[model samples]
Target: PTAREENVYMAKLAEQAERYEEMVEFMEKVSNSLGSEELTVEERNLLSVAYKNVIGARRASWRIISSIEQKEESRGNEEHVNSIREYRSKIENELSKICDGILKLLDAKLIPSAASGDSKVFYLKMKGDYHRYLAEFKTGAERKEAAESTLTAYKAAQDIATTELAPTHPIRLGLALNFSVFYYEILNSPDRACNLAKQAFDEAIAELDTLGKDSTLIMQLLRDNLTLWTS
Candidate 1:
């Protein structure tokens, strides 16, 4: 089917229009149709960009919704709290749908067929990312499972990336950036986060001229996070 190119073109339009949610919708098919071939750098970036924006808005709202429910309960407003739970439940389901969808895609197809180290690293990092998203709203056994899966994915990617890609490669730096963030935000270990990011920052800085524009950009983020996490 010519649907492959058509969807990719449509996905590009959605990306250019800055409607990343729609981009995710199309790009999912775009990635699916890729079959055994490794994803190109552009496709990998689009997957990250589109899904990150979609999941980010949902994640941010969950934080806000949690606080609203908490505050309402503190006021002894069962009536208001009822509506708050209703809204929060919908928000939680919406979030779960997204993370679960991506995790399934990555687990079932994308990662399995990946032919290159770069694609391998990208897909594994995304599994970590989606699981981290799931961890944010989960509780009890579910949260424990999600957190563990996130670590598994991140560490697997790190294992391959540190040996397979140069530290100055943007894909490597991007993986490092997200993994450090996972340490900071999900695991709540500021020291590990700082050390992880600082090491990537120093290694990238040591081979600064070997970096691309994107690698340099990710380096800036690494340093920025270091300053924030350390202070």
Candidate 2:
């Protein structure tokens, strides 16, 4: 494909992914409510399964994309078809595990992720503990503690974000913006969110400025988040 065609295709893919994200978000909300006992038993069961699948499926796809991009050499156009096939199979298998885990959690009526003021490390430790728990644990406390360890990791990550990364790093800005959103919306910690977002845009855009003004997703993201700063 030509450059223009490739750009168009990528844009379409991004659009579709965004759409799917919206649907998945809705399903997740429904699942949370149902899990909170707001749904009929039958309805809750069905959505619980769906919620599990969406979470797993999305994560699997993200992993596949990350894996492909991580390859040293481009797989090339010739490998596209085969890559899609492999990715599809992998997504299905991983998604199945997610659904199974969801069912187990629902059976126990256990939900996780508390805003203990350690959003960064909290997320990372939770993932690690989840893997360990999935591999061996029969109880929730061990898994929960493992998750708390992630909060420690998040603090380290945050320190790096503030100190080492600086405001000029695009990746850092993107990450900061993301973290800002999570802290603001989920934790009711708007002050931290506001501070992070300000730093993200102010520093990142200055960095972008050195690259010369251009219309890009990163730029657009900055503008979108910048609005929150004002409002």
Candidate 3:
């Protein structure tokens, strides 16, 4: 295989192994080697995937730090809280760079277009994730901008899924679940959350009629969310 092919293969393997930093390194090498003018559809897609993976991994790691920060705060461990915050800020910097790269790709029309079927849904979802993470952790004007960005991205993704995908489609269901949580937990809009939760529950029931026992798990998940929202 060519070096490009080998690099992509290694990156995929690293991604599968959850070694996201390694995946990013491999993917960056290939991306730089190909240059913008030489990027094919598949190469651009792979770069996008690498960016998403790096963002996800960083978010996961930051969440760990945030959790510990919370614990330290509860114990009034000021020093530990400061340390964790510093680490989390670094993670946010890394996340910002990776997300910017992905958005640039999309803006350049390197990533697949929104009208080209379901790929846009994934892109928007990831964009939402990036913004949501920022919204949750940032302060002042930055937080406000991040929150608005998150809402915009998620709404676009949800709208597309509603129109183009089955109710039971994992992407649709997943968006409904996260969107509901964002309303209730992040935005403090319980009424909106409850309404979306109900819609998701009804959609799951409708899906069950078509999918039968195969949809038991997702149906259960929706039911659980409804119970939480109603209570």
Query: How many Å off is the CA of 176 in candidate 2?
Result: 0.5
Error of 1 at 9 (Å): 0.5
TM-score of each: 0.89, 0.35, 0.74
- Segments in model 2 whose C-alpha atoms lie over 4 Å from true places: 1-151, 166-168, 210-216, 229-231
lDDT of each: 0.87, 0.47, 0.73
RMSD of each: 2.3, 20.9, 4.3
lDDT of 2 by residue, 1-231 (tens): 654334334433433565433433344444453332333333333433344345655565655664664462354554665666566556645554654554344334332332232333323322332343222322367445533443443455566556655455444554565556555543456787677677667766676678632224654665676576566
Ranking by lDDT: 1, 3, 2
Ranking by TM-score: 1, 3, 2
Cα RMSD, model 1:
2.3
Predicted structure with the largest TM-score when compared to the true one = 1
Query: Model 1 over residues 26-85: C-alpha lDDT tens digits?
Result: 889888887667667787777778889888888899899889999999999999999988
Worst 10 residues of 3 by lDDT: 108-117
Q: What's model 3's overall lDDT?
A: 0.73
Error at 217, model 1, angstroms: 2.9
